[PDB]
Amino acid sequence: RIWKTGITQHIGHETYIRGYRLLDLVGNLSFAQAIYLILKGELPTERESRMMEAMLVSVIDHGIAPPSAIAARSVASGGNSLNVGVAAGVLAFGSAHGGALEDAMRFIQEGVSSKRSVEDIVKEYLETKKPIPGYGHRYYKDFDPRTKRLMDIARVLEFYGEHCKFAEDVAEEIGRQKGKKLVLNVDGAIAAIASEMGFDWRLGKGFFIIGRVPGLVAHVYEELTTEKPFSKRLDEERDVEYTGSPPRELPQELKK
Amino acid sequence: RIWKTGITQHIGHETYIRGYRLLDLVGNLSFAQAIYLILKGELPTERESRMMEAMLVSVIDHGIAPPSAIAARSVASGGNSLNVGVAAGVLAFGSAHGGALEDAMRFIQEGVSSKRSVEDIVKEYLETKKPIPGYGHRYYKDFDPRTKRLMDIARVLEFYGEHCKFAEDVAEEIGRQKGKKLVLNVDGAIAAIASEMGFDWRLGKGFFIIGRVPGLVAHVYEELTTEKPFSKRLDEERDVEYTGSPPRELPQELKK
Amino acid sequence: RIWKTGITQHIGHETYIRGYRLLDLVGNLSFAQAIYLILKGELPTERESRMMEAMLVSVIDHGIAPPSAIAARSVASGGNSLNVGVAAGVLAFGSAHGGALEDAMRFIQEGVSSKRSVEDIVKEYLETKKPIPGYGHRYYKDFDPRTKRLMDIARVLEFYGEHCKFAEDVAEEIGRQKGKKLVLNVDGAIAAIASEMGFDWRLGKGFFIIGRVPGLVAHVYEELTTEKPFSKRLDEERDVEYTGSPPRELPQELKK
Amino acid sequence: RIWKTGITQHIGHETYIRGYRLLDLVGNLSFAQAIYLILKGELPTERESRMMEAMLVSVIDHGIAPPSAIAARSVASGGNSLNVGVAAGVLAFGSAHGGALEDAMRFIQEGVSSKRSVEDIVKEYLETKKPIPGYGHRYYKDFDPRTKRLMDIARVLEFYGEHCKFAEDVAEEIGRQKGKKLVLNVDGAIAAIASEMGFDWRLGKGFFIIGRVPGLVAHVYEELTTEKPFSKRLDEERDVEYTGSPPRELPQELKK
Ligand SMILES: CC(C)(COP(=O)(O)OP(=O)(O)OC[C@H]1O[C@@H](n2cnc3c(N)ncnc32)[C@H](O)[C@@H]1OP(=O)(O)O)[C@@H](O)C(=O)NCCC(=O)NCCS
Ligand SMILES: CC(C)(COP(=O)(O)OP(=O)(O)OC[C@H]1O[C@@H](n2cnc3c(N)ncnc32)[C@H](O)[C@@H]1OP(=O)(O)O)[C@@H](O)C(=O)NCCC(=O)NCCS
Ligand SMILES: CC(C)(COP(=O)(O)OP(=O)(O)OC[C@H]1O[C@@H](n2cnc3c(N)ncnc32)[C@H](O)[C@@H]1OP(=O)(O)O)[C@@H](O)C(=O)NCCC(=O)NCCS
Ligand SMILES: CC(C)(COP(=O)(O)OP(=O)(O)OC[C@H]1O[C@@H](n2cnc3c(N)ncnc32)[C@H](O)[C@@H]1OP(=O)(O)O)[C@@H](O)C(=O)NCCC(=O)NCCS
């Protein structure tokens, strides 16, 4: 059998999620707790449950400006069902729009497991001019308030552990070595928290997708119900710079 | 400005969701409550919050068999990032795999607002041989346990209202008119509950997408981490029936 | 066997397309001729071959302004492989960006097969205020030059037939009944030509997709190789109009 | 202006592709020639034109078995428009289903430009156990007939050059060093030909997408017109192996 899975099975037409009867989860687990279960394979603790609710809310939407929203709404504008627009948004979560969560989780997890000093790890990255994933922001040069909020919650709950500490120690050390502070950004913060929960770095973008899809749904629904179809189109004379060949004739012999 | 929105804005680089500071929502609202807010535009009541958690959990996954899971995992098998596989799954939520939520919400809402008798509404549909959306199941002929669970919760919470009543009254009336019971299925149940919350029928598939994306993430992650790339391919001799032209030669003059 | 097909089969690991050995088609049929074969199931005539080359070239690209190009390039900007950006473009070919080909083919084919007068058909549509598919243009009020080019070729080749005639007769009749000319647009022209070839109206968008994908590839490649990742993002203060709730505080009791 | 392009522009509402009036290309260039133009930026020679027709035909379809066809048809089965199914197919062209064209073009181009001996290049790859892109096949151990057909055409046309020679010299050298022949497969053959044309290796998947989309259209159209919606679903008891947790009860305190 080529179709193998350990996620879900049906016993007597009833759905079981990671071994639990779905009908027993309905009304008893929150959606974030059920998400933790389906992804991890086991029920979350109370502290994990609260952190998962906070991580997912943290990324629920970022407005109309990101390429995901532009893509989702442009596909909707072409005259498509809501699922099709949302899917187009999800496609935009590439290396520059979600991949940093995977990269930062790998860096934080490998950093903690290496048992090498934060000084040595940061020196090695800064020396080879390789970007440290999950650090830096165009505007925030003191701290990323989204990271601070998540870390404050992690500390109040006594969830904050070795991965959170490592991620913050690295920001402080980058500042020390560069003489210029580089913040632990929200991608690095979510990566630290998901790592603290024991999730594989290869699942990093999953948290972002699950959290942001409600925002995409809102954007696509708004485009479909408040805008005329085909309204998302550029005005070539106003919005576009042409950089190509000026007009030219085909060779005469090719004209029929 | 062609890019208009009432969903989110940034004030001093901080994100505001439907007017609320996102950093104040983080740690204070559950993910399902934040979903209600972003979609509806206002905070949910306590009863709405509980029903939204239950609806979303109800659809979190349905195993590897649906075309969404097949598509998501086949795209992942082609050697793609997790977002790309999940998006392919979302594309599969078409008229036969999610559209019934839109249709059932329109039927339930129009049914309630018409103030026509349930007998008359059902007689008109059965007479014109048009399928009644949100009713019937291949296996469940007494009741859909997923609907029963959701409706039991709605009744315990005193959330059950005119839309839930209408949806159940229609199932009973179909049974009365056909002499054969046709259940209110889980699509009809979610449609009734979302209608009870005052959501537009055009948002119906949104609830399904938001709820099921965690399952798609789990399936795509499992395919990427437990299976060899390109393992999702058919065996033509074993799995395929060819119904086309038998082999034939091109005309000789076309062979160079 | 649930996987049935009459398109392609393998005999001794060799691919056969609609019964012809693919290796015999390579070097002997043009790409447009092979497209006709795979879609229709039989080889094209010389006139069909020339018309298919012309239809496909007619739609090869329309610049960066359409929502398909915007979506494709925005997905590429998110940091994605070329296939992922192209696919996002294809998603945008909805009811307002390709669906008119399906609609116009159905209208032209049903119009020709009804044997009702063009006067009566147009009167019935204009009376019920239903848009006639494949007619009208924002700028072209005399003739669509893209339609004229295709129809001139169809006439020179003696391909122009009952479907082409019907489509042009309808434009003339709309003008006669409205006292204002409404052109047969390029969607209607391609629909007429594909109908003249005997293709099903349900394949209409297929011609557009096949023809335009080279343009999408060009756009995505250009975005990936000439622009910095994440460059396709709006500037909220400059490009966006916010129409939602002004900022508001959460209820105090919800703040922890 | 953030939307820059050198591909297409409009002058007086008329489309210009790489500086040529689109209406002059229609009826005068074949579709494969127009594809070459839009991708390369200049008109093809007669030999390039013939090779482009042959490359594109070579990949037009591969039947229902690949994950692209499975994904496209499964999305169509969910009840979606033809563009949506085709797009899902295109998403499946990942690292294991199209990426080898990019890799093989880079290898062939870098191999030719290095001016290092084929012996040295192959020894370095075989020593580090890195797969050589564009070589090997599960069944063909003497030669890939699809490569032979393309190379025979390239030789008859006097198109065969330094890139084609390098690609074939590498297959012969792998055989010499391993004592077991590894064929130049069709991905390597197309990569060699596209490299001979001077295309960038980053465009490799583009040729595959453009060539295969007609096959995807055929598959999606066939699924939509010959199969019942939702027919593409697995039978869990027959097709799936469950490898997860056996059923288990939730903790009693969580049951309300
Ligand atoms: C957001 C971003 C573009 C802003 O960078 P910026 O405006 O150049 O940063 P600053 O002005 O504060 O300057 C920081 C300095 O450290 C460098 N730097 C920036 N981010 C860095 C990082 N994450 N790791 C190491 N060095 C970094 C900059 O080049 C600059 O160097 P300088 O000494 O030559 O001046 C950038 O930091 C970034 O890409 N962050 C995310 C990193 C990431 O996650 N990437 C990998 C996954 S995609
Ligand atoms: C799941 C489904 C395929 C199973 O149908 P089934 O196995 O034929 O149903 P049953 O064997 O219990 O028989 C029910 C009878 O009512 C009909 N019927 C089934 N679902 C019906 C519905 N929702 N409304 C009205 N009539 C329906 C059947 O044709 C059958 O008629 P009969 O008197 O000729 O025997 C079907 O009920 C269905 O499609 N349900 C969803 C409906 C929906 O939401 N569609 C619209 C949005 S896609
Ligand atoms: C491109 C388009 C938006 C431009 O329309 P426009 O600028 O309003 O057209 P005009 O100014 O030339 O006026 C044409 C008149 O006929 C109407 N009209 C426009 N297109 C029409 C059509 N295809 N069929 C019937 N009536 C049409 C207009 O409403 C207007 O009516 P009026 O008597 O009240 O003034 C429009 O014609 C269109 O949508 N064309 C494509 C139609 C199509 O294929 N739709 C169905 C598939 S999506
Ligand atoms: C199709 C494929 C799976 C079949 O491989 P196979 O059945 O193992 O091959 P064979 O049985 O003929 O044996 C060839 C030998 O060379 C190795 N080999 C296979 N393909 C190779 C390649 N392209 N380069 C180098 N070594 C290769 C095999 O491991 C085997 O080694 P052995 O000495 O230990 O027996 C494989 O060759 C392949 O993946 N080809 C495509 C390569 C490619 O393009 N990859 C990079 C982009 S994804």
PDB file of C-alpha atoms in Angstrom, chain D residues 114-236:
ATOM      1  CA  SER D 114      35.097  25.054 -17.269  1.00  0.00           C
ATOM      2  CA  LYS D 115      37.124  23.545 -20.161  1.00  0.00           C
ATOM      3  CA  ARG D 116      38.070  20.713 -17.687  1.00  0.00           C
ATOM      4  CA  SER D 117      38.175  17.191 -19.102  1.00  0.00           C
ATOM      5  CA  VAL D 118      35.012  15.090 -19.030  1.00  0.00           C
ATOM      6  CA  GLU D 119      37.088  12.393 -17.183  1.00  0.00           C
ATOM      7  CA  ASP D 120      37.966  14.833 -14.356  1.00  0.00           C
ATOM      8  CA  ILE D 121      34.449  16.270 -14.054  1.00  0.00           C
ATOM      9  CA  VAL D 122      32.876  12.748 -13.847  1.00  0.00           C
ATOM     10  CA  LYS D 123      35.597  11.473 -11.431  1.00  0.00           C
ATOM     11  CA  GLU D 124      34.914  14.443  -9.074  1.00  0.00           C
ATOM     12  CA  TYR D 125      31.111  13.713  -9.072  1.00  0.00           C
ATOM     13  CA  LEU D 126      31.400   9.930  -8.685  1.00  0.00           C
ATOM     14  CA  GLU D 127      33.977  10.381  -5.864  1.00  0.00           C
ATOM     15  CA  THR D 128      31.698  12.665  -3.770  1.00  0.00           C
ATOM     16  CA  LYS D 129      28.592  10.373  -4.364  1.00  0.00           C
ATOM     17  CA  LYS D 130      26.618  13.403  -5.683  1.00  0.00           C
ATOM     18  CA  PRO D 131      24.023  12.459  -8.367  1.00  0.00           C
ATOM     19  CA  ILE D 132      24.974  13.675 -11.861  1.00  0.00           C
ATOM     20  CA  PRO D 133      21.834  15.487 -13.113  1.00  0.00           C
ATOM     21  CA  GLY D 134      20.211  14.312 -16.327  1.00  0.00           C
ATOM     22  CA  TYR D 135      21.673  10.759 -16.195  1.00  0.00           C
ATOM     23  CA  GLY D 136      20.199   7.363 -15.435  1.00  0.00           C
ATOM     24  CA  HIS D 137      16.837   5.634 -15.932  1.00  0.00           C
ATOM     25  CA  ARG D 138      14.962   2.851 -14.078  1.00  0.00           C
ATOM     26  CA  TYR D 139      14.450   0.817 -17.307  1.00  0.00           C
ATOM     27  CA  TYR D 140      16.728   2.187 -20.061  1.00  0.00           C
ATOM     28  CA  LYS D 141      20.285   0.928 -19.484  1.00  0.00           C
ATOM     29  CA  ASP D 142      21.582   1.158 -23.123  1.00  0.00           C
ATOM     30  CA  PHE D 143      20.058   4.431 -24.284  1.00  0.00           C
ATOM     31  CA  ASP D 144      16.999   6.566 -23.631  1.00  0.00           C
ATOM     32  CA  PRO D 145      15.061   6.463 -26.959  1.00  0.00           C
ATOM     33  CA  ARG D 146      13.689   9.935 -26.262  1.00  0.00           C
ATOM     34  CA  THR D 147      17.219  11.309 -25.984  1.00  0.00           C
ATOM     35  CA  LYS D 148      18.276   9.399 -29.136  1.00  0.00           C
ATOM     36  CA  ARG D 149      15.367  10.869 -31.104  1.00  0.00           C
ATOM     37  CA  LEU D 150      16.177  14.445 -30.028  1.00  0.00           C
ATOM     38  CA  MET D 151      19.923  14.024 -30.667  1.00  0.00           C
ATOM     39  CA  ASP D 152      19.308  12.405 -34.070  1.00  0.00           C
ATOM     40  CA  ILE D 153      17.208  15.443 -35.037  1.00  0.00           C
ATOM     41  CA  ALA D 154      19.880  17.815 -33.651  1.00  0.00           C
ATOM     42  CA  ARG D 155      22.514  16.011 -35.809  1.00  0.00           C
ATOM     43  CA  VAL D 156      20.373  15.942 -39.025  1.00  0.00           C
ATOM     44  CA  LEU D 157      19.805  19.700 -38.629  1.00  0.00           C
ATOM     45  CA  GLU D 158      23.486  20.463 -37.850  1.00  0.00           C
ATOM     46  CA  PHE D 159      22.265  21.972 -34.562  1.00  0.00           C
ATOM     47  CA  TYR D 160      24.199  19.459 -32.415  1.00  0.00           C
ATOM     48  CA  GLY D 161      27.030  21.392 -30.791  1.00  0.00           C
ATOM     49  CA  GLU D 162      29.343  21.668 -27.807  1.00  0.00           C
ATOM     50  CA  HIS D 163      26.592  21.264 -25.181  1.00  0.00           C
ATOM     51  CA  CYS D 164      25.027  18.200 -26.850  1.00  0.00           C
ATOM     52  CA  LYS D 165      28.544  16.687 -27.268  1.00  0.00           C
ATOM     53  CA  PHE D 166      29.439  17.343 -23.617  1.00  0.00           C
ATOM     54  CA  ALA D 167      26.186  15.768 -22.389  1.00  0.00           C
ATOM     55  CA  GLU D 168      26.784  12.596 -24.465  1.00  0.00           C
ATOM     56  CA  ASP D 169      30.502  12.478 -23.641  1.00  0.00           C
ATOM     57  CA  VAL D 170      29.583  12.491 -19.915  1.00  0.00           C
ATOM     58  CA  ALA D 171      27.249   9.457 -20.350  1.00  0.00           C
ATOM     59  CA  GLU D 172      30.019   7.520 -22.116  1.00  0.00           C
ATOM     60  CA  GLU D 173      32.542   8.486 -19.399  1.00  0.00           C
ATOM     61  CA  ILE D 174      30.183   7.490 -16.532  1.00  0.00           C
ATOM     62  CA  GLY D 175      29.915   4.068 -18.247  1.00  0.00           C
ATOM     63  CA  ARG D 176      33.701   3.856 -18.572  1.00  0.00           C
ATOM     64  CA  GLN D 177      34.300   4.772 -14.878  1.00  0.00           C
ATOM     65  CA  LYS D 178      31.457   2.664 -13.376  1.00  0.00           C
ATOM     66  CA  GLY D 179      31.726  -0.353 -15.760  1.00  0.00           C
ATOM     67  CA  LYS D 180      27.894   0.029 -16.029  1.00  0.00           C
ATOM     68  CA  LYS D 181      26.196   2.321 -18.554  1.00  0.00           C
ATOM     69  CA  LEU D 182      24.047   5.229 -17.195  1.00  0.00           C
ATOM     70  CA  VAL D 183      22.018   6.829 -20.014  1.00  0.00           C
ATOM     71  CA  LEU D 184      21.684  10.499 -20.862  1.00  0.00           C
ATOM     72  CA  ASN D 185      17.962  10.684 -20.009  1.00  0.00           C
ATOM     73  CA  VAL D 186      15.379  12.929 -21.638  1.00  0.00           C
ATOM     74  CA  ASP D 187      15.832  15.594 -18.919  1.00  0.00           C
ATOM     75  CA  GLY D 188      19.556  15.747 -19.707  1.00  0.00           C
ATOM     76  CA  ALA D 189      18.782  15.782 -23.495  1.00  0.00           C
ATOM     77  CA  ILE D 190      16.368  18.736 -23.218  1.00  0.00           C
ATOM     78  CA  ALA D 191      18.806  20.477 -20.886  1.00  0.00           C
ATOM     79  CA  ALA D 192      21.607  20.023 -23.479  1.00  0.00           C
ATOM     80  CA  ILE D 193      19.450  21.347 -26.328  1.00  0.00           C
ATOM     81  CA  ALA D 194      18.158  24.344 -24.339  1.00  0.00           C
ATOM     82  CA  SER D 195      21.788  25.062 -23.339  1.00  0.00           C
ATOM     83  CA  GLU D 196      22.865  24.826 -26.993  1.00  0.00           C
ATOM     84  CA  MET D 197      20.205  27.577 -27.647  1.00  0.00           C
ATOM     85  CA  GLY D 198      21.872  29.795 -24.984  1.00  0.00           C
ATOM     86  CA  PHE D 199      19.073  29.673 -22.409  1.00  0.00           C
ATOM     87  CA  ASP D 200      19.796  30.264 -18.731  1.00  0.00           C
ATOM     88  CA  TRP D 201      19.678  27.106 -16.548  1.00  0.00           C
ATOM     89  CA  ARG D 202      17.174  28.951 -14.315  1.00  0.00           C
ATOM     90  CA  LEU D 203      14.625  28.653 -17.137  1.00  0.00           C
ATOM     91  CA  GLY D 204      14.894  24.813 -17.350  1.00  0.00           C
ATOM     92  CA  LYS D 205      11.593  23.960 -15.733  1.00  0.00           C
ATOM     93  CA  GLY D 206       9.882  26.508 -18.023  1.00  0.00           C
ATOM     94  CA  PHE D 207      10.334  24.296 -21.052  1.00  0.00           C
ATOM     95  CA  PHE D 208       8.782  21.362 -19.207  1.00  0.00           C
ATOM     96  CA  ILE D 209       5.864  23.398 -17.986  1.00  0.00           C
ATOM     97  CA  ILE D 210       5.073  24.860 -21.387  1.00  0.00           C
ATOM     98  CA  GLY D 211       5.340  21.456 -23.064  1.00  0.00           C
ATOM     99  CA  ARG D 212       3.327  19.485 -20.488  1.00  0.00           C
ATOM    100  CA  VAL D 213       0.460  21.927 -19.827  1.00  0.00           C
ATOM    101  CA  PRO D 214      -1.425  20.681 -22.947  1.00  0.00           C
ATOM    102  CA  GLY D 215      -1.345  17.183 -21.435  1.00  0.00           C
ATOM    103  CA  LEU D 216      -2.609  18.552 -18.103  1.00  0.00           C
ATOM    104  CA  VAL D 217      -5.442  20.330 -19.911  1.00  0.00           C
ATOM    105  CA  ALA D 218      -6.358  17.064 -21.620  1.00  0.00           C
ATOM    106  CA  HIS D 219      -6.314  15.158 -18.300  1.00  0.00           C
ATOM    107  CA  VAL D 220      -8.367  17.740 -16.421  1.00  0.00           C
ATOM    108  CA  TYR D 221     -10.896  18.054 -19.234  1.00  0.00           C
ATOM    109  CA  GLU D 222     -11.214  14.244 -19.348  1.00  0.00           C
ATOM    110  CA  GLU D 223     -11.718  14.068 -15.566  1.00  0.00           C
ATOM    111  CA  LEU D 224     -14.395  16.830 -15.649  1.00  0.00           C
ATOM    112  CA  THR D 225     -16.357  15.402 -18.593  1.00  0.00           C
ATOM    113  CA  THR D 226     -16.081  11.626 -18.106  1.00  0.00           C
ATOM    114  CA  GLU D 227     -16.053  11.023 -14.331  1.00  0.00           C
ATOM    115  CA  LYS D 228     -18.483  11.750 -11.582  1.00  0.00           C
ATOM    116  CA  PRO D 229     -17.404  14.496  -9.176  1.00  0.00           C
ATOM    117  CA  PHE D 230     -15.577  13.200  -6.112  1.00  0.00           C
ATOM    118  CA  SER D 231     -14.670   9.911  -7.853  1.00  0.00           C
ATOM    119  CA  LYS D 232     -10.940  10.428  -7.044  1.00  0.00           C
ATOM    120  CA  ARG D 233     -10.884   9.277  -3.455  1.00  0.00           C
ATOM    121  CA  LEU D 234      -9.169   6.337  -1.819  1.00  0.00           C
ATOM    122  CA  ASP D 235     -10.886   3.383  -0.079  1.00  0.00           C
ATOM    123  CA  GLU D 236      -9.254   3.421   3.373  1.00  0.00           C
TER     124      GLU D 236
END
